[PDB]
Amino acid sequence: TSGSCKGRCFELQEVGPPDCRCDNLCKSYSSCCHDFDELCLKTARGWECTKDRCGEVRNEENACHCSEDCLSRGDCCTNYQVVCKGESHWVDDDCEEIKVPECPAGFVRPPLIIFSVDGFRASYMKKGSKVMPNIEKLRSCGTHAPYMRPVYPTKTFPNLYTLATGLYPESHGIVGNSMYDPVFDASFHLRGREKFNHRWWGGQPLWITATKQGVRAGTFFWSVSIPHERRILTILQWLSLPDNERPSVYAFYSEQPDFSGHKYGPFGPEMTNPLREIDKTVGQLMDGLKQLRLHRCVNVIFVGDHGMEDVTCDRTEFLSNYLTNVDDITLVPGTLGRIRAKSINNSKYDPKTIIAALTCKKPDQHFKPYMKQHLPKRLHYANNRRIEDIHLLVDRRWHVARKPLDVYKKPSGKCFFQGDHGFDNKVNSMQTVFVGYGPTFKYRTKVPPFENIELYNVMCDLLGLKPAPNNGTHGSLNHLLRTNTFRPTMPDEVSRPNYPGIMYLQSEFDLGCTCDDKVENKLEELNKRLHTKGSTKERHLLYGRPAVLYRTSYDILYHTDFESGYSEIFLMPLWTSYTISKQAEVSSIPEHLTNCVRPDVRVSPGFSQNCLAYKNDKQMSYGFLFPPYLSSSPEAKYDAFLVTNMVPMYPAFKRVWAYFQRVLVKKYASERNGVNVISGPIFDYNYDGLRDTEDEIKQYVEGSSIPVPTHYYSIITSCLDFTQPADKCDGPLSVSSFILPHRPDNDESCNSSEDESKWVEELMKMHTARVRDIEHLTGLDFYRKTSRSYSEILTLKTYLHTYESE
Ligand SMILES: *[C@@H]1O[C@H](CO)[C@@H](O[C@@H]2O[C@H](CO)[C@@H](O[C@H]3O[C@H](CO[C@H]4O[C@H](CO[C@H]5O[C@H](CO)[C@@H](O)[C@H](O)[C@@H]5O)[C@@H](O)[C@H](O[C@H]5O[C@H](CO)[C@@H](O)[C@H](O)[C@@H]5O[C@H]5O[C@H](CO)[C@@H](O)[C@H](O)[C@@H]5O)[C@@H]4O)[C@@H](O)[C@H](O[C@H]4O[C@H](CO)[C@@H](O)[C@H](O)[C@@H]4O[C@H]4O[C@H](CO)[C@@H](O)[C@H](O)[C@@H]4O)[C@@H]3O)[C@H](O)[C@H]2NC(C)=O)[C@H](O)[C@H]1NC(C)=O
Ligand SMILES: CC(=O)N1CCN(c2ccc3ncn(Cc4cn(Cc5ccc(Cl)c(Cl)c5)nn4)c(=O)c3c2)CC1
Ligand SMILES: [Ca+2]
Ligand SMILES: [Ca+2]
Ligand SMILES: [K+]
Ligand code: NA
Ligand SMILES: [Zn+2]
């Protein structure tokens, strides 16, 4: 329909029907005015000034200009000043520190330009260095990480929309490049028009955050047919608008190197040219900023969405080789698998039978099936109706597909892809890049790897915006910035602990427990009282007690070897803290104590567990949070069998936990020069990543009010300088943590019939976690009392130990 784009090319506000459009998305909607190509997508004479064009008479048909008036008009070719005025390319200038923003009059804040590169694997920064001089200059002179961790799945739209919102895909709704929503009864795909509907896109992306707070934002999407040179010239033209019209935040997107990486693999020889071409585009941007005198004013972020792995058609697993009944299912295929019933509302579809048929069926099987609530909690990939209940985690370098005909297409089955991405976000080949350059970033600074969920807060800081609620930890990336506008502070403690003394006689308890503890001095009786009053607490609680950030009733319980915060509501510790030195010795549970459980005279019978419930529950056993194997003396070992240290455990899980406690804790103390361990239960029955309230618990020990944890955590801290013992550390800390699923079987571990030394540690590594993940799941706040700055502690809480090689 009708109108003209004269005077309207790349207008910022999109016009409503029936009026035709002239903005940078009108092509995607087939809604541009008929003269949009003619007026807005000029190409005559290409994108570069030449010597013979210098000072030309302006010819408006040209793609860009070399006329004397072009700087005033804002539409010079980006190399105009170099060719026509003797200037140097930005890449050829020495790095010079940008201590303060150097901006033209009228600029109220440094603009932010986000330059996103699809499929830019982290190791391209080294491996492609010789063909990317502009990017290497941004990297070396600005602030860079060795790599940036994407979100799972490591696909384009989930990651770019995470970058824009600070949200996990399960929260922002873009949970794959393909998705089916069972309420909409509709599917979203990379290609097509359904993804234009705003019903798919949740959260608050940066451009909306900025607009609501009075900061103008350019579009972050681009029509694919608009060439990169024209995207750069358009951004530079917008930067020349009047102050009251000019955006403060801009986004450039490149479909390369991903497009070629799929065809040629991550390091195919064909990949050098796409890297060269992206570098040239960065140079056009920087040259263009330098002409506008903005190159020491704007903050530039150069960021990718995910990496790229070697993947070929022949490395495909077929569900038809496992399932007799493969026509009953629908599979979202590829570098991940998502399975649902082919016929919705079909009652003759059993996910349990499908999982079983996919579990450990072939020795080198290259995927593992999970119910989504059992996936590693670090993936945060379950709380959305668009995530199917059955998930297949696929090994790097592989695909999964339903049937052979899906992969080998007629005529005879040629392949024609060599790279893909989508795998587990800890996989090295999926890691991507981050560089920040400009006045607000630091100068020539390396920062440790971090997660892309953290960047929304930083981008808000760079623009003076208050971030919408999101999954970043605001302050954890303050060390990226020269000038911080956000001062993080610790959350206030909500519940204060009770400190019970001895209040109950043994005969008040009727727990059905027994212990052979009658066995057998004024000197060591005082010592025992001192321990129960907290005399060793500075050894075992090294970073202060955790703060409880919700309303509850709990008790602090001191012992010689461990301290705990015991919930009178959940009838078990929320946390148990203990230090094991490098010199600590492992001992057995003595024979006469195998089934010992002891009432705790500090805690009322009515707020205790009972052994009868465990006897009656034929599926459920128990373990201990402070391990009896690591008692400091035979006398202290009796403390470990208190009813207040006991937690419900399936026998299958006790194999995992006992090996962790008996073998692995001491191994870590040996390797790290002592460790401090905080362990506890987690209840997440609705798999939202957040601590359950008591009325959300779906399973109890039979006949009791003892709730069954869905997971058990541990946080294992030591001195970053391992020449210092964990309990006498002067400097920064080192942490690894896990959130183990509390499962009644070890079907996840295909080698679980072997000795635990052959599979338990592999399981724990898969379920590695950030301290922050545990905080969300428990409502606790750790590291309250250290000598370290709070921003440093926030970085520490977001650390993930991934167990990949370098
Ligand atoms: C990562 O960070 C995120 C962000 O902080 C965390 O997610 C948040 O988690 C909280 C707690 O679960 C949740 O709380 C509230 O949700 C209900 C309101 O939801 C709707 O409005 C939200 C706010 O919108 C406004 O502000 C935003 C700024 O962020 C703007 O973008 C908006 O335009 C608007 O101005 C909105 O964000 C939310 O969006 C969800 O739903 C959309 C439509 O389906 C979808 O498009 C989004 O993608 C998003 O979907 C996610 O979240 C929903 C849950 O909201 C999931 O189901 C999805 O699967 C997906 O994960 C909505 O449009 C509010 O009603 C809730 O209050 C009830 O429950 C609380 C306690 O839980 C109780 O105290 C109340 O009394 C109330 O109870 C009553 O209702 C319930 C039914 O809900 C009923 O059973 C009961 O009997 C009562 O009658 C609750 O306060 C946030 O919504 C959520 N935000 C987002 C963006 O996901 C996340 O936890 C964190 N992750 C981790 C691991 O830390
Ligand atoms: C949320 C919202 O406001 N919506 C829904 C999306 N609607 C839409 C309309 C026209 C479109 N034209 C072309 N393309 C290709 C394309 C991909 N990318 C990379 C990129 C950049 C930023 C993000 Cl956040 C992400 Cl996920 C991915 N940039 N452009 C689009 O996807 C497209 C989408 C616009 C209105
Ligand atoms: Ca991508
Ligand atoms: Ca929960
Ligand atoms: K039992
Ligand atoms: Na097994
Ligand atoms: Zn791709």
Ligand 3 is an ion; its neighbours by CB within 5 Å are 118, 156, 258, 305
Helix, strand or coil for residue 441? strand
Q: Check: CB of residue 699 under 8 Å from CB of residue 708.
A: yes
639 annotated binding-site participant: no
Q: Check: CB of residue 610 under 8 Å from CB of residue 704.
A: yes
Q: Strands 112-118, 249-257: parallel, antiparallel or unpaired by DSSP? A: parallel
Burial class (CB in 10 A: 0-12, 13-18, 19+), 80: buried
Reply yes or no on whether 330 is catalytic.
no
Nearest to 462 by CA among 109, 144, 790: 109
Distance 43 CA to ligand 6 centre (A): 62
* 742 contacts: CB under 8 Å, gap ≥ 6: 649, 650, 653, 708, 709, 710, 711, 712
d(Cα 691, Cα 696) in Å, to the nearest integer? 10
- Give nearest CA residue, ligand 1 atom 98: 171
Q: How far is C-alpha 595 from the chain's CA centre?
A: 42
List the Cα angle 764/770/774 in 5-degree steps: 90
Helix, strand or coil for residue 440? coil
Q: To the nearest 10°, the Cα dihedral for 234, 237, 242, 244? A: 20
* 34 contacts: CB under 8 Å, gap ≥ 6: 4, 20
Nearest to 262 by CA among 479, 77, 49, 416: 416
Query: Which pair of tokens denotes residue 348?
Result: 């003759």
Stated resolution in angstroms: 1.5
Q: Does residue 115 have its Cβ closer than 6 Å to ligand 2?
A: no
Q: Check: CB of residue 459 under 8 Å from CB of residue 206.
A: yes
d(Cα 301, Cα 250) in Å, to the nearest integer? 10
Nearest to 739 by CA among 691, 698, 671: 691
Q: Strands 450-451, 148-149: parallel, antiparallel or unpaired by DSSP? A: parallel
Q: How far is C-alpha 651 from the chain's CA centre?
A: 32
Q: Does residue 157 have its Cβ closer than 6 Å to ligand 2?
A: yes
727 annotated binding-site participant: no
Distance 649 CA to ligand 5 centre (A): 9
686 annotated binding-site participant: yes
Query: Which pair of tokens denotes residue 412?
Result: 């005879």
Helix, strand or coil for residue 686? coil
Helix axes 455-462, 156-165, angle to 10 degrees: 50
Shortest-distance ligand to the CA of residue 311: 7
Q: Check: CB of residue 622 under 8 Å from CB of residue 513.
A: no
Q: To the nearest 10°, the Cα dihedral for 240, 244, 248, 252? A: -50
List the Cα angle 355/359/362 in 5-degree steps: 140
- Length of the chain counted residue by residue: 806
* 728 contacts: CB under 8 Å, gap ≥ 6: 719
Distance 754 CA to ligand 6 centre (A): 9
Task: Give the atom of ligand 2 at the shortest distance from the alpha carbon of 159.
Answer: 26
Which residue has tokens 């930083």?
Answer: 458
Q: How far is C-alpha 136 from the chain's CA centre?
A: 26
Could you please report the per-residue DSSP string of 326-344?
A: GGGEEEE-BSEEEEEESST
Query: Which pair of tokens denotes residue 393?
Result: 């985690």
Query: Which pair of tokens denotes residue 53?
Result: 């064009």
453 to each of 148, 459, 557, 689, 789, how far by Cα in Å? 10, 11, 37, 15, 22
* 476 contacts: CB under 8 Å, gap ≥ 6: 450, 454, 791, 794, 795, 797, 798
- Give 12-20 contacts, CB < 8 A, sequence gap 24+: 12/216, 12/218, 12/219, 12/238, 12/245, 12/247
Q: Considering 78, 154, 156, 473, which one is annotated as catalytic?
A: 156
Q: Does residue 543 have its Cβ closer than 6 Å to ligand 2?
A: no
Neighbours of 599 (CB within 10 A): 23
Q: Does residue 169 have its Cβ closer than 6 Å to ligand 1?
A: no
Nearest to 451 by CA among 25, 726, 798, 62: 798
Q: Check: CB of residue 495 under 8 Å from CB of residue 548.
A: yes
Best probe residue, ligand 2, of 221, 222, 255 (max atoms within 8 Å of C-beta):
221
Q: Strands 621-624, 112-118: parallel, antiparallel or unpaired by DSSP? A: unpaired
Helix, strand or coil for residue 656? helix
Q: What single-letter DSSP state applies at residue 660? A: I
Task: Give the atom of ligand 1 at the shortest distance from the alpha carbon of 168.
Answer: 1
Query: Which pair of tokens denotes residue 453?
Result: 């969920």
Best probe residue, ligand 1, of 152, 168, 170, 171 (max atoms within 8 Å of C-beta):
171
Instruction: Tell me the backbone φ, ψ of residue 174, rounded to 5 degrees.
Output: -95, 85
316 bridge partner residues: 399
Q: Check: CB of residue 213 under 8 Å from CB of residue 428.
A: no
Helix, strand or coil for residue 392? strand
Task: Give the atom of ligand 1 at the shortest distance from the alpha carbon of 690.
Answer: 104
- Give 58-66 contacts, CB < 8 A, sequence gap 24+: 63/229, 63/230, 63/233, 64/233
678 to each of 50, 119, 176, 542, how far by Cα in Å? 67, 38, 35, 10
Q: Does residue 201 have its Cβ closer than 6 Å to ligand 2?
A: yes
d(Cα 628, Cα 586) in Å, to the nearest integer? 9
Q: Strands 572-580, 563-567: parallel, antiparallel or unpaired by DSSP? A: antiparallel
Q: Check: CB of residue 351 under 8 Å from CB of residue 390.
A: yes
* 148 contacts: CB under 8 Å, gap ≥ 6: 122, 303, 304, 431, 432, 433, 434, 449, 450, 451, 452
Distance 222 CA to ligand 2 centre (A): 7
Neighbours of 97 (CB within 10 A): 12
Shortest-distance ligand to the CA of residue 687: 4
Q: Does residue 167 have its Cβ closer than 6 Å to ligand 2?
A: no
Q: Check: CB of residue 395 under 8 Å from CB of residue 87.
A: no
Ordered alpha helix ranges (H), 156-227: 156-165, 169-172, 206-212
Distance 156 CA to ligand 3 centre (A): 3
Could you please report the per-residue DSSP string of 604-637?
A: -GGGS--HHHHHH-SS-EEEESS-GGG-SSHHHH
Distance 585 CA to ligand 3 centre (A): 50
Query: Which pair of tokens denotes residue 665?
Result: 């804790």
421 annotated binding-site participant: yes
Q: To the nearest 10°, the Cα dihedral for 790, 792, 795, 797? A: -60
Instruction: Tell me the backbone φ, ψ of residue 678, rounded to 5 degrees.
Output: -115, 120
List the Cα angle 506/509/513 in 5-degree steps: 95
Neighbours of 249 (CB within 10 A): 24
Please indicate the experimental technique that yielded this structure: X-ray
